[PDB]
Design an enzyme around this catalytic site. Structure first.
Site, PDB file in Angstrom:
ATOM      1  N   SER B  63      46.964  44.060  37.337  1.00 14.71           N
ATOM      2  CA  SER B  63      47.021  44.858  38.557  1.00 14.71           C
ATOM      3  C   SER B  63      48.184  45.839  38.611  1.00 14.71           C
ATOM      4  O   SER B  63      48.191  46.708  39.493  1.00 14.71           O
ATOM      5  CB  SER B  63      47.122  43.944  39.777  1.00 14.71           C
ATOM      6  OG  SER B  63      45.857  43.461  40.154  1.00 14.71           O
ATOM      7  N   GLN B 119      36.677  40.694  43.568  1.00 14.46           N
ATOM      8  CA  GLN B 119      36.052  41.221  42.367  1.00 14.46           C
ATOM      9  C   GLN B 119      34.736  41.911  42.703  1.00 14.46           C
ATOM     10  O   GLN B 119      34.088  41.619  43.712  1.00 14.46           O
ATOM     11  CB  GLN B 119      35.785  40.107  41.347  1.00 14.46           C
ATOM     12  CG  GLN B 119      36.971  39.231  41.019  1.00 14.46           C
ATOM     13  CD  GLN B 119      38.041  39.957  40.244  1.00 14.46           C
ATOM     14  OE1 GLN B 119      37.856  41.098  39.815  1.00 14.46           O
ATOM     15  NE2 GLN B 119      39.177  39.298  40.062  1.00 14.46           N
ATOM     16  N   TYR B 147      43.182  42.490  49.717  1.00 18.03           N
ATOM     17  CA  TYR B 147      43.456  42.857  48.335  1.00 18.03           C
ATOM     18  C   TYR B 147      42.183  42.781  47.513  1.00 18.03           C
ATOM     19  O   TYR B 147      41.501  41.751  47.501  1.00 18.03           O
ATOM     20  CB  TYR B 147      44.501  41.920  47.756  1.00 18.03           C
ATOM     21  CG  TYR B 147      45.077  42.334  46.426  1.00 18.03           C
ATOM     22  CD1 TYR B 147      46.143  43.212  46.360  1.00 18.03           C
ATOM     23  CD2 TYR B 147      44.580  41.820  45.239  1.00 18.03           C
ATOM     24  CE1 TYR B 147      46.696  43.567  45.156  1.00 18.03           C
ATOM     25  CE2 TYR B 147      45.118  42.179  44.033  1.00 18.03           C
ATOM     26  CZ  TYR B 147      46.175  43.055  43.995  1.00 18.03           C
ATOM     27  OH  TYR B 147      46.725  43.413  42.791  1.00 18.03           O
ATOM     28  N   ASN B 149      39.968  44.539  43.876  1.00 15.19           N
ATOM     29  CA  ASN B 149      39.769  45.473  42.777  1.00 15.19           C
ATOM     30  C   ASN B 149      38.722  46.526  43.105  1.00 15.19           C
ATOM     31  O   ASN B 149      38.710  47.590  42.474  1.00 15.19           O
ATOM     32  CB  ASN B 149      39.339  44.726  41.516  1.00 15.19           C
ATOM     33  CG  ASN B 149      40.447  43.902  40.926  1.00 15.19           C
ATOM     34  OD1 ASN B 149      41.601  44.308  40.948  1.00 15.19           O
ATOM     35  ND2 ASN B 149      40.104  42.743  40.381  1.00 15.19           N
ATOM     36  N   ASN B 341      50.182  34.038  31.978  1.00 16.88           N
ATOM     37  CA  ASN B 341      50.029  34.157  33.425  1.00 16.88           C
ATOM     38  C   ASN B 341      50.823  33.023  34.062  1.00 16.88           C
ATOM     39  O   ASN B 341      50.437  31.854  33.970  1.00 16.88           O
ATOM     40  CB  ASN B 341      48.549  34.104  33.804  1.00 16.88           C
ATOM     41  CG  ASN B 341      48.302  34.381  35.281  1.00 16.88           C
ATOM     42  OD1 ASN B 341      49.113  34.028  36.133  1.00 16.88           O
ATOM     43  ND2 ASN B 341      47.170  35.013  35.589  1.00 16.88           N
TER      44      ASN B 341
END
Lengths: 363, 362
Positions: B63, B119, B147, B149, B341
């Site tokens: 991101s 998503q 938030y 994508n 991650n």
């Protein structure tokens, strides 16, 4: 002879069992026989809206897309842009000295690679990384047929690079127009969405759509209609209408390149005698034959395109299950498109029964 | 005045604990401070072959890619190609009359859309089908920050379309050259592969790689190095000699567009006062801000780019965990890139401690 209405009646009866067995939401059969087109359409392209399936419904072809990839490569060959008998390393020089580099281009379409995996490795994120991965790959079972998206996908990549465009551009700007298609896409545009069926996941029944992936356009990227697929099958049956280069390319893809335990492997097409026991076609399309490397012997020179055979290809996505069959000696082509992935063997059994009952009408 | 050697030693000390806690295979810290670039590099970019991580190792930014998407949009605006205050429907006419069509372009970068899936839905196979899906979408929590994508990805698509090229082309042929980057990519080429780190899955420790997807290029498609990310941070600090148009675009992205419970939402960048309690930056970077809609209030007109603030952004993929922080009033930028991650709050805690120790050397 039989009416097209009686032909549609036979198609209805041949697929009623599988539709019930696997809860297929929508299904379309196209038949071209002695130059004449018949369609059976049933169910829904989309549950929400209860949108009916028709001969102009767009379905995901899955691996049937590979027929287009193979034909594109043969078209480039006919134009003198590549040589399908040449090694991969003539096209991808950094694979010189690597086992994969020694594979003939044509064998990327026969899957005779010596054991390449079915899918692009998860640690590979684009074609450049795939080529690097192939630098160190060694065939685990040299000489075997290993059904894969990777090899045929890379053939499409190589072919498009030679034509100086993306695979999508090559298919949509060059190949599909030469074939006279009117609703076949690699990238479905807005003006066609009204006719784009949804696929329905087996386990969840949810609408699901094939998604982008490495070599997806090249290996399983085509969406088409029963009507357009009959146009392709007419060209494969030699009904005429394509320019000489495309005709030569189609013929090249129907040469027999290798023999397996169950069939002759052409460029993507898989070819049996006709007549043939349905159980043999079920075995050749069987899960266990497909998912593991199998012995194959090369034909050199290739077998010319044959008359009294059945050529076939299965193709599926998570949401779709399709099948195409070509019987040149019977002037017969069949396409079966469904928005449910149901077993290859079931597609084969139902279509073999349809063909048998259809040809029996002229007895 | 701290030397690069003691800065590198401070970076080392600041991240040794988190690297052990989350078994991070490789990690690179870049610091630009008073115009000086310093790097701490440790571990491996790839366990197979024990390939060392360096300031030229390429990491998946996840991101953090969205900073590039937002900057491209602002560059197009500065050129007169777009108006970020205009509704989406001015760019996508078939969304006229639809709730999504009424969203301002800039709010695709603030995430103030009223609730979108994180998503792209599974029933959507390309951007054309996404636009068709959006025709019938209605926000489940109007006015909230969601938030996603989907929104920022669509801003990238809209911007590239206005410029008449693909997003990868706009990024690689226009934006990255304008910023003077030399190893930043949307599509990593062969000549860069030797430096392209692998990510390592949290559960299986296997090498993993971000895969193609709808709007992936636009929303999480950038891969870069510590050396290039410090060049970007220098541009945000007014260093590096950007031409007026790129300066205007960068400044536009640093305007404050909305206020949340913990920070000022800019275009993708999220902004706190400096100094600030680390617990506040931990809360604002919590996963609840990803997973659930959060209240936000619009600033009209926007807050101008601020001096005594810290701007930050987290970015991850299944295999990578990254963080960027920018402190304009301290002439300081930090990038932390890792091929594991690990939790947002951990990146925030270690970076805040590094910043605090750095500034205290004065």
């Amino acid at each position: 002879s039989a009416t097209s209405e009686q032909i549609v009646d036979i198609a209805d009866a041949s697929f009623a069992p599988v539709i019930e067995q696997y809860r297929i939401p929508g299904l379309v059969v196209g038949i071209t026989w002695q130059g004449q087109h018949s369609f059976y359409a049933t169910g829904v392209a989309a549950r929400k809206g209860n949108v009916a399936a028709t001969p102009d419904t767009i379905f995901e072809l899955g691996s049937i897309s590979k027929i287009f990839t193979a034909t594109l490569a043969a078209l480039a060959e006919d134009r003198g842009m590549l040589d399908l008998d040449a090694p991969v390393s003539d096209s991808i020089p950094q694979l010189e000295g690597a086992a994969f580099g020694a594979i003939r281009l044509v064998d990327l379409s026969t899957h005779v690679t010596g054991g390449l995996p079915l899918q692009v490795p998860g640690e590979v994120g684009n074609v450049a990384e795939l080529i690097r991965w192939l630098e160190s790959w060694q065939p685990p079972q040299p000489g075997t047929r290993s059904y894969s998206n990777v090899s045929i996908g890379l053939l499409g990549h190589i072919t498009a690079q030679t034509m100086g465009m993306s695979f999508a551009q090559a298919a949509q700007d060059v190949l599909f127009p030469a074939m006279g298609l009117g609703s076949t896409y690699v990238d479905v545009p807005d003006d066609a969405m009204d006719r784009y069926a949804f696929g329905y996941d087996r386990k969840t029944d949810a609408p699901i759509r094939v998604n982008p992936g490495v070599l997806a356009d090249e290996a399983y990227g085509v969406k088409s209609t029963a009507r357009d697929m009959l146009r392709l099958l007419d060209l494969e049956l030699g009904r005429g209408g394509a320019n000489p280069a495309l005709t030569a390319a189609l013929e090249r893809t129907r040469q027999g390149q290798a023999e397996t335990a169950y069939y002759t492997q052409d460029m993507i097409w898989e070819q049996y005698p006709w007549p043939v026991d349905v159980a043999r076609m079920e075995a050749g399309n069987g899960y266990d034959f497909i998912l593991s490397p199998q012995p194959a012997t090369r034909l050199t020179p290739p077998l010319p395109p044959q008359r009294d055979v059945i050529l076939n290809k299965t193709g599926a996505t998570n949401g779709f299950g399709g099948y195409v069959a070509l019987l040149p000696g019977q002037d017969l082509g069949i396409v079966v498109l469904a928005n449910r992935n149901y077993p290859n063997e079931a597609r084969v059994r139902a279509t073999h029964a349809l063909i048998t009952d259809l040809l029996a009408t002229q007895d």
